[PDB]
Symmetry: C6
Subunit: 197 residues, 6 copies
Amino acid sequence: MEEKIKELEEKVEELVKEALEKKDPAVLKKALVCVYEMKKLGMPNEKLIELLKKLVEVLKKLALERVDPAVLDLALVCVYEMKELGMPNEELIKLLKELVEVLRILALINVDPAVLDKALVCVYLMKELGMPNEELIKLLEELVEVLRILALIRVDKRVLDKAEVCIEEMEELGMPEEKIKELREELKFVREILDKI
Amino acid sequence: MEEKIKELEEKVEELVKEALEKKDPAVLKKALVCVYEMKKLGMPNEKLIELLKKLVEVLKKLALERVDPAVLDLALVCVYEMKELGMPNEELIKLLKELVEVLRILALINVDPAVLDKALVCVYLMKELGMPNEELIKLLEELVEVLRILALIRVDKRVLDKAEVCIEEMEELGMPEEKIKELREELKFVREILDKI
Amino acid sequence: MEEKIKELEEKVEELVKEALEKKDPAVLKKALVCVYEMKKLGMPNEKLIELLKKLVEVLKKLALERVDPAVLDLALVCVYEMKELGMPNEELIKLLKELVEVLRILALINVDPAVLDKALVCVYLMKELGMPNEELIKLLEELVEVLRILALIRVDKRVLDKAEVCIEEMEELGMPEEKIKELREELKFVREILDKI
Amino acid sequence: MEEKIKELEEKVEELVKEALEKKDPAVLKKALVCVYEMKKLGMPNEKLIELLKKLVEVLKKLALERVDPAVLDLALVCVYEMKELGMPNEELIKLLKELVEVLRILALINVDPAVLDKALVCVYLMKELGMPNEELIKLLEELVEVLRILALIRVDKRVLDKAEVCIEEMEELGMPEEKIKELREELKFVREILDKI
Amino acid sequence: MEEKIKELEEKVEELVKEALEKKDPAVLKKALVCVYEMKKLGMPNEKLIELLKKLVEVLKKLALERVDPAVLDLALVCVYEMKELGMPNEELIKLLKELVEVLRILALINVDPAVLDKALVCVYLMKELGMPNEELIKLLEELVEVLRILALIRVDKRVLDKAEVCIEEMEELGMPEEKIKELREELKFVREILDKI
Amino acid sequence: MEEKIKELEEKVEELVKEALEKKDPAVLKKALVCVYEMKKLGMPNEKLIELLKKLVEVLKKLALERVDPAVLDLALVCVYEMKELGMPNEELIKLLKELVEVLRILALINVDPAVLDKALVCVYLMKELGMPNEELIKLLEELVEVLRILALIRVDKRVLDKAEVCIEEMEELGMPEEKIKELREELKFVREILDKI
């Protein structure tokens, strides 16, 4: 067995090197096939976690350097693979904070609200795993920001309701109602412009 | 007769050797046409079964080494051809276990729930052919898992209802009610997340 | 006159030789135009029937060596041309029995139920022309087989209703009710699986 | 003036020779643009009629030698241009018989019922201009045949209703009622088949 | 500043000479951008009207020498630009007569009614700018002609109602009622044929 | 830190230099990624505002020299980046006047009503930032003009309703009614033309 495992690590290594030059996730799909083969053979769970890291920490670069959200969907399923292998909860929370930030930047520059839905499900996953409350308030305020901006750049009334649901999450978590009211006013102001269109 | 049969075997052989380098099921389609011609020519039923194994096995490799679902549809047909030629029930249950265990990995890595329906069809086929109750529950737990994951990776409420249906098949198959309620609570949690959207 | 007739036979045979190498029906479409021109010139009706055979018996080979079913639509039209020219009803039934077989192999290998409707139309045309009942039972049984298999590969409830209609044709031919009940049981079993989906 | 007129005739000639080698109506669209300039320059109306004839009698060759219907739409336009220029009624009736007599063979070989509507329009145009009554009935019987054949090759009930309306034109034009009942029986037979589908 | 002004005239010249040989309007879009820059630089209004004439009198020639309608949309815009800069009403009416004629020819040679709406808009614009009722009637009779022809060639009931509205404009402009009755009879004859569809 | 900041400034400016020659926004998207990296590295706010200016003042020239509107969407995002980053309100009003003054040309030369919505939201942003009444009213008259022109160049009722809403913004913001009544009469004339269609 261990010969194949080393050869599959070599495939993952060769494919990382090639993928960074080709800028395409298909090269890393082959690498995940090899990761799942190593898992099927049986391998140290920590080595499988670090192999998964050695892909997540390359998928970000690929997703940025060729602006594309779909590359991150493959990354997200590998986060649940590290969950199932027993990566520590603090490390999951670290990784998820980090991936939320590449969604946040990519959703802005590509001008697309649908990509933010990944961020919302990741924020609820960190609510499940127990990230500190002020840090949820931060990512919800931030994602309310990118929803607000995209609702102005592209005309669609629905985008503001998602932000209002995220305001109710900050209300449910507890925050000074002065901030809540400020945010509400901004969203209803943007609605009063989209009402015209 | 026998010369055409041998020349059709030689065609299957060379088409297989081409297909693995070419990476396309279009090559294997002509090989399967030639398998049907050898059926019409009355080649021995066991030889057809073995040639069909020596296409199912190549379809698995092709489907993995360039990821899409469609290649497997030929394998699903060829399983019923082996049923009809009289391959033993134990060998059908073997290949159906094995092929479900390629649907599962490809559904994850390509991020698509639609392929999972074929796995459910194959589960009910192994129910028809008499797989043991625990082993049916095992694939139903697994496919409930890949449904749960794709219901988180993309927003669509319907995916969880198919999972709920499959939990009720494990209930029909006598799974412990404590495990049923654990699984249910997870799916209702994912529905409460999708209710936001 | 006869110079144009020979030149059209030359066009037909040289385009046949070309088409087999190029693998496309568009080469034969020009030959079929040249066949209609030979009809317009009053070429003997038997010579025209034989020229139509010399296309039908090449259309099937093209339609196997590449898998697309649209090539057969010319064959179907040319069967009615031989009907109009007065080819014997027994020989129509022979050509139709032959053509119905290529429809089966493309339905299966292309994994597509929509082509089978053409087989149902041809079964009813042999009902019109007077095939012996037990041979309709064969084709009807076998076609409900391909319908049953594609209802498992491709998930759509409607396919089984065509199969029920074709069981009612076997019941209209008076086939023993033991077979009807077996076929029905297998179909409501497949419906009960598709009811899940 | 006459220099431009002759250079436009030369353009028509050069474009006709080019079109027949290139096999594309866009070369002839250019020639018709030039004919419309020659028409605005007020050259002899009979020369314009013969120039339009020398495009109609090349559009048909193009439309056969590669099969698509849209080439004929130019021809049908130029028929009304020749009507307006005052071409004798028997030439219109002759050319329109000829175009009906290309719509048939192209509608058959492309297996497309939708083109036949242009034929029915040209039938009613020859009803306006007058034709010997049995010749309308011949073209209506023929088009009722291509409608019947395409109602078998394409599964769609609607095609038989157009044919029924056309039978009622043969009824209005007074072919004997036994022949009408033969046509009707054949069409309700095809409807009883398409009722299954 | 005058250096940029003459350089923008030279850019118009260069891009015109390129466009007219290359045959694509995208080259003239840049020349118009340079015209709008010269307007912003306060180039004299009559020079700008002549520069605009020196593009309209090339858009038409491009739009004939390869046949598509969209090239004329620029010209329709630039006419209102010339209106704003103070082109004489007689120059507008002349030029709009000229452009309406290229819509009329292009609507025949390419089998499409949708372009004729732009001609109807220009008719109402010359109604606003004060063309005589008799000349409006001339264009309305012509556009009723091309509507009638396309209604027959490429069957759709709806096209004919626009022509009825345009007959009511000739009635409003004042036309001898026997002519209105002739046109109505021809148009209802065309509807009675479009009932056979 | 400062080495990465200088390298990111160099990576911006060298992509900008080639973006102008290549003529595509995908080059500048990578430069804007590197701008967000320089904010992440804490480069001083006034240098980041300068870089955002340097980028916007190249986005416009690209969006003119190739005529498509989507390039401006980045510019709108970077304007809100400068808002948040703390560029003074009067020079936001300057940049927003300047950017509206490319939409107003690009909407005409590549005929499209839909882009004007991006201008209307920027007008209401300059309302929020407090540009003077008569300067908004000028842009609203101008955009009511481009809405008027496109409502004539292509048929759609809705374009006039946006313009009516915008005229009522001028009534709210304060302008005498003779302008309102003139504008209304013109828009009602365009509705009366579109009522024909």
